[PDB]
Enzyme design. Sequence first.
Site, PDB file in Angstrom:
ATOM      1  N   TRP B 218       0.834  -1.189   0.000  1.00  0.00           N
ATOM      2  CA  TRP B 218       0.000   0.000   0.000  1.00  0.00           C
ATOM      3  C   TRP B 218       0.876   1.249   0.000  1.00  0.00           C
ATOM      4  O   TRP B 218       0.802   2.070  -0.908  1.00  0.00           O
ATOM      5  CB  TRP B 218      -0.915   0.033   1.219  1.00  0.00           C
ATOM      6  N   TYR B 222       1.037   4.121  -2.944  1.00  0.00           N
ATOM      7  CA  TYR B 222       0.684   5.499  -2.642  1.00  0.00           C
ATOM      8  C   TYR B 222       1.884   6.401  -2.859  1.00  0.00           C
ATOM      9  O   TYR B 222       1.736   7.535  -3.321  1.00  0.00           O
ATOM     10  CB  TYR B 222       0.205   5.641  -1.190  1.00  0.00           C
ATOM     11  N   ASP B 238      -6.157  -0.402  -0.643  1.00  0.00           N
ATOM     12  CA  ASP B 238      -6.641   0.769   0.081  1.00  0.00           C
ATOM     13  C   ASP B 238      -7.957   0.429   0.792  1.00  0.00           C
ATOM     14  O   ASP B 238      -8.839  -0.228   0.224  1.00  0.00           O
ATOM     15  CB  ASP B 238      -6.857   1.936  -0.886  1.00  0.00           C
TER      16      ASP B 238
END
Lengths: 282, 282, 282, 282
Positions: B218, B222, B238
Amino acid sequence: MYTLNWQPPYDWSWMLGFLAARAVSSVETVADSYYARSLAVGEYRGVVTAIPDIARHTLHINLSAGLEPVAAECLAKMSRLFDLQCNPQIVNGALGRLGAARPGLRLPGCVDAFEQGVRAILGQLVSVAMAAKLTARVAQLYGERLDDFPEYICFPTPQRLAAADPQALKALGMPLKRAEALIHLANAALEGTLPMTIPGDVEQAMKTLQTFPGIGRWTANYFALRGWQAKDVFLPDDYLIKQRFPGMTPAQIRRYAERWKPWRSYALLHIWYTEGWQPDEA
Amino acid sequence: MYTLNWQPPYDWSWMLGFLAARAVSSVETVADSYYARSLAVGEYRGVVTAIPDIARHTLHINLSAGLEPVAAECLAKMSRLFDLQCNPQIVNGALGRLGAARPGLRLPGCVDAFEQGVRAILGQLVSVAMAAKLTARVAQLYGERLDDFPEYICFPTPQRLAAADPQALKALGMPLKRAEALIHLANAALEGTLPMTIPGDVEQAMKTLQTFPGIGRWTANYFALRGWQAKDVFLPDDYLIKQRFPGMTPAQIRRYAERWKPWRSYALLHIWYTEGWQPDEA
Amino acid sequence: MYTLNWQPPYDWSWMLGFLAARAVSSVETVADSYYARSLAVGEYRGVVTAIPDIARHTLHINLSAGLEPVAAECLAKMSRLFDLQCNPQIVNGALGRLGAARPGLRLPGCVDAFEQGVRAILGQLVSVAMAAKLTARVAQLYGERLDDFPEYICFPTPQRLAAADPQALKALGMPLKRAEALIHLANAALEGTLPMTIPGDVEQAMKTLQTFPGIGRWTANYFALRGWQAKDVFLPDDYLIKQRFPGMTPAQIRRYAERWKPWRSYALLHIWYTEGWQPDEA
Amino acid sequence: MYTLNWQPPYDWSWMLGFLAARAVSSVETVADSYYARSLAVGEYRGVVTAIPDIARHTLHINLSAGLEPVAAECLAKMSRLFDLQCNPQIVNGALGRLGAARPGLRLPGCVDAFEQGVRAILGQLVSVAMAAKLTARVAQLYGERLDDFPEYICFPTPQRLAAADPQALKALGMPLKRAEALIHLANAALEGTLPMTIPGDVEQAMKTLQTFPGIGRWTANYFALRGWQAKDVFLPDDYLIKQRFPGMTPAQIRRYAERWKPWRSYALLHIWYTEGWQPDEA
DNA sequence: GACATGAGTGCC
DNA sequence: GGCACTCATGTC
DNA sequence: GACATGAGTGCC
DNA sequence: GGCACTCATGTC
């Protein structure tokens, strides 16, 4: 169309001279009054023209339609190539006499760290004219031609050099080891392992670069100087430098340069461009 | 003072709304008509102000006296934070109906990958508001206060965060492993192991990032999206994305997201900010 | 000629049978009262013949002249092959009912860890008989023939297999991947990277073995069991073993296998050779 | 009472004398008519006794009851320690003059590679009688004493020196670096990284050893010579060797020694034990 | 069977 | 959300 | 003797 | 120039 200012004095005659001796045919074009070359930022491609307005100490930058969407990045690239941030007073003051014969001396940067990496490797051993011609053959074989400028060719990207055949590169007039150096450097750039911007610890960074095959102390120092525009690095291993310090060993020379910290990169340029210079026999 | 172009449409209301919810006190100030923050380019410091001009499809940038020597790099930072390069006709043409409601959506970037990595990490398993306040504490505790503008502090350098006490950070409001993750990231930034600009192989670079302590899939995605402004990455792991795709598993979401290549990052944003959005039952 | 002792009971028919089923043509010869095969100890080569004597619980070993100079290493290789060290009272006492049907069961080892490593790799997926067919082919093409005994050929050395062409091995009847695994093993063997004697921490060493290409958990365990004569290893991934523990998952079989510590290798062999064995109805 | 062969001549007086000086109190007992020492193989332990029989060119080995189970391995350990495989007519037929005085010279091996590595380390920069006294302390503190023979004690195992407190080792009479060397060595022995038998490529393996903390070239060469019984290694870095080749650099010594290939190890033994030996005018 | 990929289940 | 750690898939 | 550093040599 | 290897040298 776009304009960037600088702080006088700035020796444009020297900068263009330095850059013109190293120009890569089909990629760059250097004239007494302007600089221009192909430029690629991601998938955006075009030509950049830089015109120095001495009188008003400002640099006029024109961008081909293809680069307009990433105009600012192109501007930052020119500012690094032309060391426009330099405050000559601080440097000329900190270097005293060494930087008095030409206080407009700037550190010639680059437009892209990868390119400079390739240039640095191909610069190994051969003369400047040979390095240039050698680099030109690599560009003609792997570069991207601009559809709106058939005379211009983009400097090879990491994606193309990474897939290159070692023997094809060898055929251009370079040892196999140097071709493998390029292919490995390209792979690092793809993986994100090649610092494209000056790291906080230039010393550790260079040490890591030296683990790359084909890259030794000279190449890493020269790459840091031009590719990251690191302002405090010396090249005690440089051929011309070893001639400026007769009888001294890499460490003795290196020990002598401590006196110019933290602007050793500038001191290096001056000593290089002063044939008469010689050290102080303590 | 300085001006940068952008192609319409551009939803400034939304962009400033996104940056405003994540604004860090003392570091940046977001208003209805402008954005402002501390900025450090090497040793040069100051405040940058960005004021959009809808009438001209332009962004006006003002730099405080301390950033003029590196004005171009500052302009480039702002163009990366506001995605000025984006051509909405191309993105929307491909995204189809998905973006039809807000054709002015842009990808919020960052002014520095290190900072963004630090922010991506402090945003783990917490509310936007908490992450915001949490980051502020780290800022005041390790940032460089601007002399010319006392209320503004520059974001912590990799330098300062590398030599920080893992406890002094936990104290501020984070597990021990969270603080180690930052300290590790800082070290990586010091020697050039953290890619500061987007690499040719985003897939591979993210894999390497995931070997970092405190950085999973994640965080790595990001980070690519905001720190490198990669345009074709999706975030199946997410929390919120899982709600927009009732039931479905990571590999299934990912598989469905394939239809928006090569603009998955944009598709992602449209889905995040579209309340009752749900996949085609087909 | 040379004689070695063992402790009753010793099921020589089970042992000889076990070896006959895996015997490689040109390398070994198995009968109901003796075992003989080619054997290389460094630059010394020849034939070893082992004849058991049930009456006085002794094993007579004969060596052709080529092996006389290294007699003792030959004796050691033979004693490991036949597990002369085993104390059935201890092992049968710990296993209980599991080994009461064949209290004379022994752990068939090897004459050389490198060989066993090659044999284990070629034993992947295929049947016992087929693996012996393949090994015979590999030995035929890469092994040396004994001048003194034409009918016999020495198992391929590490230096020979290391300098073999993957394609040449592919043709003998194995995927390209499998043949590469063999060449890698030979290299580790030349370098001293393949433990040739049982290590103090078998678990760790097997983990290291799994980093090798072509060697998964099954091959590492099986190799550790035969090549090192590790007495406490189970084989939960084994084809027949899963057939003995119907519907049970690897970690389940493994947890079950724990009750046989520290003689899991012997329990494994007893289970393979109990026609209708099944976990306790509990 | 087992028996092993050897080819004449065999200088037992010289052999026993070499082991006698390096004998470690409580582990080995050396006399002019026999050698005896404690010995371990896995968890089987006991005392081994070796009695030379000049008359029949035979060596009589006796094993206590606790070793009987693994008699064969014990016989192999002794044959390696005493170089029973040596064909003196071949070695001397190659060394010529150099070996004409002591045609019965043999290469003193070791009973176990780990043990030999420890002795190689604890023999660094100290006298022979001293390494012997120190090693005896280590054996005394980390060895398992034999219940059948109280007087004797087993040499330390890798698992024991591995769980050793550096400080505790140092206190026995050695620098810290050294104690650390022993602990690393035990670890390597545990996970199978320390080759226990001579590898196909002795030079490659000696290089891998030089990366172990505390192991330089002299230690690697020596370890290979006695631990693996490598027959073609020379020690140009040896204290005494430098004295035998007055004013010659390690490279010159090594070049000279090439005349004895492929038996450099035997050449080394003859030169070591020939006071006043000196190089020709080659 | 080796090896990369996907699930998910539960823990700081 | 990072991190592990154990099944279940699906080519070569 | 191990092991950093530093000059220097010889072959890519 | 890169790089492997060699010959001191100072330290622990």
